[PDB]
Every structure is written in C-alpha cells, then in structure tokens.
Amino acid sequence: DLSAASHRIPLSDGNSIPIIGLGTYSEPKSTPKGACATSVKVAIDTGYRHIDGAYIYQNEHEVGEAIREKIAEGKVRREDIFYCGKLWATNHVPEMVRPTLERTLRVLQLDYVDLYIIEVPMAFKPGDEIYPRDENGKWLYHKSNLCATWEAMEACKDAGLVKSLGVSNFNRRQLELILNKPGLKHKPVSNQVECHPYFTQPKLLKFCQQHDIVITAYSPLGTSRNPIWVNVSSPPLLKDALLNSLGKRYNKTAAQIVLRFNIQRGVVVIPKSFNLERIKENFQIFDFSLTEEEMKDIEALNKNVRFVELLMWRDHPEYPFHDEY
C-alpha cells in the first residue's frame, strides 16, 4: 500500500497529505543557524515530501530556503511538496488571520501553503510578544472566538493562499464548534495533536475518523524531553521494553517501530530530526509492517499521560486538555 515513493493519503477536500513529514521545531537558543535548512534539504533528498513548520519556530525562512533550493535544482516541483504552517494564539483576531498567513508566505517566499492550521484553540493578547506576560509573570489572554477565526481562515483558502485548512490541539468540543458552524464552507481536514504509543488518542482518533478528519501525530517519538515544557514523568518512549523488543524482530529501532505503528493506522507522523542519520532512519518505515497482534500490543502501551500538557495555560477558557478528549 504505502511506499517510499508513494505514501500520500486523501484529505476530505480532495487534496492529499504525505503520511510522513519532517517536524521542524528546534529550541532557538540551542540550535545552530542553518540547521533547519540543511535538515529540510536532507529530508527531501531522502524522500520526505511533507514538512511541518510554524512562523513562531523562528526558522520558517530556513524552511523556505530549503524548499526553494530543491525546487530550483529540479529535485521536486512545488506541487510535490506539502508544507504545513500554523496560526499562533496572538494572531486569532479575524482581521489578523490573512495578514498572518501572508507574512508566512513572504517568509517562505512561496505563493501558497498546502495546509494552514490554528495552532492552539487559545487566543492570546495580540502584539509583538508570542508569549504575552506582564510584570507579575501573568499570562495576558484574549477572548477566543473560534468560529470567527475559522471564517477568516476560510477566506484565505477562497483567495488561493492555502490548499487545505485544519487545526491543532483541538478537543472534541472545539472540533464540533467548527463542524456545526452555521454556513461552514471548508471543514477542517486535519487535527494535529500529540500522538504516540504512550498517548494513543483512541477516542479523539475515532471522532476525527467519523468526520473524515486526519490526525497528524505531533511529537510522534515522544518529544525531545525538554523539562522546560515537557512532562518528564513518563519514562523515555524510545527506551520502552516492548518497542525495543519489537525493534529487534524487524531489525528496526524503537523510533522506526513507533512511526510505523502510527502510519499503519492512518495517522500522519511528523518526527523532527536535525541529525543526518536520524532523518534517514525515520523515513525507513515502508519496508516492513506490524502484525495485528503487534499493533494491539503497542496500542496497549497507552498511558493517558501527555508529554505536552501546557500547564501554564490551564486557566485559559480554551485550554483543550481538561476534557477527556
């Protein structure tokens, strides 16, 4: 079915999405300039045709540089590459949506993005700080209006600036808000959420499948485990006994097992690596398949514990993780 050369899966709007992509978030202060560009180039050389980025990752210009270089040399055409960008919390006022997308297009120096998603359902105070905090370290929120923000997203697709629209970190209630919107023109085609064997998203996945929404698994390898924002209560995913045991069977790493697990169930995976060897490693997931019993045993590792909890924002009205799913 899925192969290195052909692994795009249908989106509900008639477009398609490569089932593996390269994630591109990297801690700004601890990442060498140019590392993102180099990695995107290597990924495309390797066979990746999907890149996940965001303006607030501070390296979207590197992503564009790499994609454009690969198009220029004839490695790919624009239509062969799938780029996903994201609308951050401080940019949710409807009037800001299109100008925010336009900034990202200018930064990439591209005519359109393949997928543009609401990055979190929470709105923060508009301004120059992506993380609005006052003197008392307090977070400066803003009142969310998801349906209104969505209408502004819809207009962006109408203008030809983006092929597909989606969301990220949305729970069932927030999804329904958009799906049940009076006059809905473009339904969300994708919800990007934390997903891996320690947090398998059983209910949210079923709900999304009901509405023909594809799940994209962010932190599909269990995160970089940066204590600053990652919940390190759970042991390292890639050190899991079962995942490693199954790895021996296929002569694959635990990483390869966990990526195969999600793509085999129709979940898009966007592992980040800026390492030459690991970029290649993560892509070698089309030359084996897991048995049904193996799939069952992997799913059974589910802990219902998130590596990405975002506790700082539990008090925002649109915090997505209070609900069961």
Pick 218 or 261: Cβ nearer ligand NAP = 218
Here the tokens at position 264 are 């085999």
Beta strand 22-23 with 190-194 is: unpaired
223 is in an annotated binding site: yes
Quickly count: other Cβ atoms within 10 Å of residue 162's Cβ.
25
Kindly report the number of other CB atoms within 10 A of residue 141's CB atom. 17
101 neighbors 55 (Cβ within 8 angstroms): no
Nearer to ligand NAP, 211 or 278 (CB): 278
Residue 83 touches ligand NAP, criterion: CB under 6 A: no
Q: Which of residues 165-204 bind ligand NAP (CB under 6 A)?
A: 168-169, 192
Q: Are strands 50-52 and 82-87 parallel, antiparallel or unpaired?
A: parallel
Q: Which is nearer to ligand NAP, 24 or 200 (CB)?
A: 24
Residue 278 annotated in ligand binding: yes
Question: How far lies 15's CA from each of 12, 114, 186, 202, 254, in Å?
Answer: 7, 9, 13, 25, 31
Judged by CB under 6 A, the stretch of 68-76, 158-166, 275-283, 286-294 that binds ligand NAP is: 275-283
Phi, psi at residue 18, to the nearest 5°? -60, 130
Q: Is 325 a catalytic residue?
A: no
Out of 48, 55, 57, 83, which one is annotated catalytic?
Answer: 57
Chain-centre distance for alpha carbon 176: 20
Residue 264 or 273 having the CB closest to ligand NAP:
273
CB of 75 to ligand NAP, least distance (A): 21
Name the CA dihedral angle for 188, 191, 192, 194, rounded to a multiple of 10 degrees. 170
Near ligand NAP in 5-64, by CB under 6 A: 23-25, 52
281 is in an annotated binding site: yes
DSSP three-state, residue 168: strand
Which stretches of the chain bind ligand NAP, using CB under 6 A? 23-25, 52, 119, 168-169, 192, 218-224, 238, 253, 255, 270-275, 278, 281-282, 308
Q: Which residues are annotated as a binding site for substrate?
A: 25, 57, 88, 119, 131, 229
Catalytic (active-site) positions: 57
